Amino acid sequence: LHHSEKKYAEEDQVQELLKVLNEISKTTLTLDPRYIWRSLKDLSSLRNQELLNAETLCFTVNVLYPDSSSFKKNLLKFITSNHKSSVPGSAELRNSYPASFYSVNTEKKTIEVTAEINCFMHLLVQLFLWDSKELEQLVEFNRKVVIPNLLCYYNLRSLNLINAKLWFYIYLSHETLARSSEEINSDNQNIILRSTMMKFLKIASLKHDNETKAMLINLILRDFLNNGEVDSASDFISKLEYPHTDVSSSLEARYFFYLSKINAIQLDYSTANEYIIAAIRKAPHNSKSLGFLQQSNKLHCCIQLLMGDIPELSFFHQSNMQKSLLPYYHLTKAVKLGDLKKFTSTITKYKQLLLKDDTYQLCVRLRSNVIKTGIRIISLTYKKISLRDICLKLNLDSEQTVEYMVSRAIRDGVIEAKINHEDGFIETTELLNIYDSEDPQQVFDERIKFANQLHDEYLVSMRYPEDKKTQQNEK
Amino acid sequence: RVPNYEVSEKAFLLTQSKVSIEQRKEAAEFVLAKIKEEEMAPYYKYLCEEYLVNNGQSDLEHDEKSDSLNEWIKFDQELYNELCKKNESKIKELNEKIQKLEEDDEGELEQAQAWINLGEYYAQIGDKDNAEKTLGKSLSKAISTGAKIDVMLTIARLGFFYNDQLYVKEKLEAVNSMIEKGGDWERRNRYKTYYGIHCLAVRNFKEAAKLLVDSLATFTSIELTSYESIATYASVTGLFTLERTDLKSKVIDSPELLSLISTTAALQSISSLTISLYASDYASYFPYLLETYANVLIPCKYLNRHADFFVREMRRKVYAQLLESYKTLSLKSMASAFGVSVAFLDNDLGKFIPNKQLNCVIDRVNGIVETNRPDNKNAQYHLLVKQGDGLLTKLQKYGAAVRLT
Amino acid sequence: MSTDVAAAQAQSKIDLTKKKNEEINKKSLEEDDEFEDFPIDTWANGETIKSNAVTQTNIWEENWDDVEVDDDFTNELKAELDRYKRENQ
Amino acid sequence: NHKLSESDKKSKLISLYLLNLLSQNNTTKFHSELQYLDKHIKNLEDDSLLSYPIKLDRWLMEGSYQKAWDLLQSGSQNISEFDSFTDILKSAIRDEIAKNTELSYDFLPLSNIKALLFFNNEKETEKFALERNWPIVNSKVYFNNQSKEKADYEDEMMHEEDQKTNIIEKAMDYAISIEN
Amino acid sequence: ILDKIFYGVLDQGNGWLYVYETPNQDATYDSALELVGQLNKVVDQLFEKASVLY
């Protein structure tokens, strides 16, 4: 009745698990098991949410577990216990297999290939928590059990890629739990979490398993960003060598996004800009990825205003995000006019929203940038312009004061002018004729190398699957 | 059919209340005469939907605002009753005739044609939903490809009639598909005129120019707003798109524009401006700019979206051409040429210069205007790299996407 | 819901079973969907999204307006005002 | 937090710590510390002296040095131990504007130099000009000499082949990639 | 000058006419704009083909 549903779901898990199990027995493989595993990842979520909650319990009991069943059952008793389908034929069989973990073979103990099955059990329970959307203690129980289970053996290459996804969910529930509410107990537990992250990474270094390391790098960077220890993060990003190999296109997207935040705080607005446009192009378009994309687009707009580049007006209208980016739309206009008065009003008015996204910190820095941007307009519109006239437009107080502002802004060399003190005006030196200079040479040189590197990336990718078709039988 | 386009145009004056007082008054009386006679009562109700607390409202069959400067759109409860009477009676009689034809044999010709006649009655009175369905029956039945084009066009007219651009957009795509299959030139001329006005309502007037020059040479008047307005549309797009020389040869390659002479206020105001740009009159130019705003842009359905857009762009052009021809000017003289004061003149210029579609700078101490636009090898270089950057980007994402899969 | 032109990014990646759950994971990481929280937070439907014609809904090609000033009022005054200074000189 | 970790002394002590970092003249560190203070007290014990180090950072990044000099001037009515970072920050500003004026000017009279470097004594202006290595001869500076030095210093450091970037070398690079 | 029938520019900063008689617009550089123009069309069509792989 209820058992029928559990049994349909159970069989689903087993075929994906059985397939992989054969693959890793021939020699540990990475990307071929990963493809299967990634599809199973989605499946477990859609069945668990929509269909029962002791549906996880049935599979876990049926296989030979090391303690995992005990760990699952505690959670369910609390929310109203289910003990049904722990009866023979659901606690006696270990699920039909040919010999790989077959019921007879396993009970007799000629084999105990519990290994992959144990990893999959961890994934089911962790997913089921996130699907339920419950935090506090349920999270703490998940963290305590699974972390030392995996570290009392040196994982083989194949098992290791599974446990990176386990490290993710533990961390995410913990982080949001701290962001639920300030608690004196939440606070002390974050030091506990911090320690484990870096230790996981060191294991991932030893086996040079590329996707394990990359995923772990993301979590460390996220936690730094939330605690405001960017100082501690500057060092960390300097000692990266990020793999671009076995990764998922989701891993690569997150990575470039994290550099941009750190970069912005280190007043790297130049490399930050490429990195955020890069992150979006790996990242899928979907409503499933929307909260990721939002934060990326907010980050991008602000980066441009800090350059003085000024985002397009177009960016805000054509996106289906106009409400979320609504403050950024008004910031773009504020800097455009050079308006202190508008700008001060915009960032106060929207303060809290900005404060949630942790971009409130970036916005206050734009107060300088209204002044610098104001002066770049003024040097374009007028070749020679009195000191007083400038004061009218930007609501300034003295001639001497605006002279300091321009003096500093052209030390950054944005305005491309030079100040006449003795005559009372500011005279631009812009006249181009830079096609008589050697400048175009440099620019052309860079484009060519980018083109050549695109060839190299065509080479590594194209011929690699060709080889495989000669290897496999299809004649 | 033909009556629709006149009614809408006059109706747009009631939609606005930034237009002239005597003009809006006149337009209300015309619309009311044809509400009685031609059944334009469903579309009169459509006007209040387009408000709900907005000016131009006064309706008493719906929401009122006599605070509005329009108070000549007011409904009557005689009107509400006249609506309901004619609506029901006409649908019932006209339909019964059609039912008989369906009973009788021959559906290839007789029945499809009979269904066209329903969709023309609903087209007339401003029912879009009811027109679409019944002309949906004509298309279902196999007929001439030319007729199918004629019918889609009757439907496309109705989107401008309500002034909903999305409805046109959709429908003119089906016309483009069937225009080649018929291969008729009769309605090829119409299609360009329709599609011209869709391009006019959106910001691409370059396309609009290319379709509407064909419409001068040959005009197809049924179901399409009258030929003096079509001149006014060609002239609008002409000023925006072209520059002196091109503009001059366009309106001498159209004899008809000159021989039609100004015979309506909108045509007069646009044509005065056309001459002065290409003859390089600046003196009387600056007043004509104001006249076009008043008598073309706001009264027109499609250029009322372009009232602020046009005036902003048109000033760039007139300045652009003068500055390109000069290394330097004096500001006071440049102000006099147009007919403004010195200080006033900067303000307009000073929005155009940082967008950098005017490529100049202004000394305020010498009082000279410097022109430092490259027009050499340096300009071609500056343009090219933007495209070549674009090519880099296209390859960066597509490259990644195929390699990962 | 996509950023800028939707079809340009719809072709870049379509539906795949591998990445589908991973799309959720990134969104959950940032914490919210961030398009449905802003209306709750403001506690009324905005009027700053109706700040321009395009900002609420854009079925046009961007004007480059974001300041939207009728320029016929100020020009009319410019013409006449200059005329008077000359006449009373 | 919410058990003797929030303290009166903590608020006072963060105000001073922030000032120490800013006097190092790395704003890079400043913002990173600043991010941490958001999650902690910055709206919970509000800003009224934790406001001061941020306001100062803003007036230097924009480069309004009247507002900056003003704030430090009013930070000398903060006689307890806050007056001890103020002197370092009045010194730093003199150097900042002296870099700026290389770009802005090539000619200043002595009177115009005196105002900009925030000196009230003529001998003090001439004192800095010797040590900063401004050639003020006949009461007029020639900043273009000074730009040459700073540009020349950027070249002198050995990287120098590919910093200049040889015409010949570009073509060679292009060639080998095709023939790889 | 607006025709560019003799090029040159009218200088009323002082009241002169500069008389240029020199080529404007280089042929080679121009056709490179069209070359990029074609390729920007072409990569879209490769991406139409690559929709099979996605």
From Swiss-Prot, chain A:
GO terms for molecular function: enzyme regulator activity. The modification Phosphoserine is found at S437. Present with 16700 molecules/cell in log phase SD medium. GO terms for biological process: proteasome-mediated ubiquitin-dependent protein catabolic process; regulation of protein catabolic process; ubiquitin-dependent protein catabolic process. Residues 463-475 have a biased composition (Basic and acidic residues). The 26S proteasome is composed of a core protease, known as the 20S proteasome, capped at one or both ends by the 19S regulatory complex (RC). The RC is composed of at least 18 different subunits in two subcomplexes, the base and the lid, which form the portions proximal and distal to the 20S proteolytic core, respectively. This is 26S proteasome regulatory subunit RPN3. Belongs to the proteasome subunit S3 family. It comes from Saccharomyces cerevisiae (strain ATCC 204508 / S288c). The keyword Acetylation applies. Residues 253-433 form the PCI domain. Pfam families: PCI, Rpn3_C. Keywords: Acetylation, Phosphoprotein, Proteasome. One of its GO terms (cellular component) is proteasome regulatory particle, lid subcomplex. N-acetylated by NAT1. It comes from the Eukaryota. InterPro entries: 26S_Psome_reg_C, CSN3, PCI_dom, WH_DNA-bd_sf. Acts as a regulatory subunit of the 26S proteasome which is involved in the ATP-dependent degradation of ubiquitinated proteins.
From Swiss-Prot, chain B:
SMART domains: PINT (SM00088). Keywords: Nucleus, Phosphoprotein, Proteasome, TPR repeat. The modification Phosphoserine is found at S58. TPR repeats lie at residues 112-145. InterPro entries: PCI_dom, Rpn7/CSN1, Rpn7_N, RPN7_PSMD6_C, TPR-like_helical_dom_sf, TPR_rpt, WH_DNA-bd_sf. One of its GO terms (biological process) is proteasome-mediated ubiquitin-dependent protein catabolic process. The keyword Phosphoprotein applies. Pfam families: PCI, RPN7, RPN7_PSMD6_C. Transmembrane segments: none annotated. The 26S proteasome is composed of a core protease, known as the 20S proteasome, capped at one or both ends by the 19S regulatory complex (RC). The RC is composed of at least 18 different subunits in two subcomplexes, the base and the lid, which form the portions proximal and distal to the 20S proteolytic core, respectively. Component of the lid subcomplex of the 19S RC. This is 26S proteasome regulatory subunit RPN7. It comes from Saccharomyces cerevisiae (strain ATCC 204508 / S288c) (Baker's yeast).
Curated annotation (Swiss-Prot), chain D:
One of its GO terms (cellular component) is proteasome regulatory particle, lid subcomplex. Keywords: Proteasome. The keyword DNA damage does not apply. GO terms for biological process: proteasome-mediated ubiquitin-dependent protein catabolic process; ubiquitin-dependent protein catabolic process. The keyword Nucleotide-binding does not apply. Residues 1-159 form the PCI domain. Acts as a regulatory subunit of the 26S proteasome which is involved in the ATP-dependent degradation of ubiquitinated proteins. Necessary for activation of the CDC28 kinase. Present with 9890 molecules/cell in log phase SD medium. Belongs to the proteasome subunit S14 family. This is 26S proteasome regulatory subunit RPN12. It comes from Saccharomyces cerevisiae (strain ATCC 204508 / S288c). The gene is RPN12. The chain holds residues 93 to 272 of 274 of the full protein.
Curated annotation (Swiss-Prot), chain E:
It comes from the Eukaryota. Present with 16800 molecules/cell in log phase SD medium. It comes from Saccharomyces cerevisiae (strain ATCC 204508 / S288c). Disulfide bonds: none annotated. N-acetylated by NAT1. The lineage of its organism: Eukaryota, Fungi, Dikarya, Ascomycota, Saccharomycotina. The chain holds residues 381 to 434 of 434 of the full protein. Belongs to the proteasome subunit S9 family. Component of the lid subcomplex of the 19S proteasome regulatory particle complex (also named PA700 complex). The 26S proteasome consists of a 20S proteasome core and two 19S regulatory subunits. This is 26S proteasome regulatory subunit RPN6. Component of the lid subcomplex of the 26S proteasome, a multiprotein complex involved in the ATP-dependent degradation of ubiquitinated proteins. In the complex, RPN6 is required for proteasome assembly.
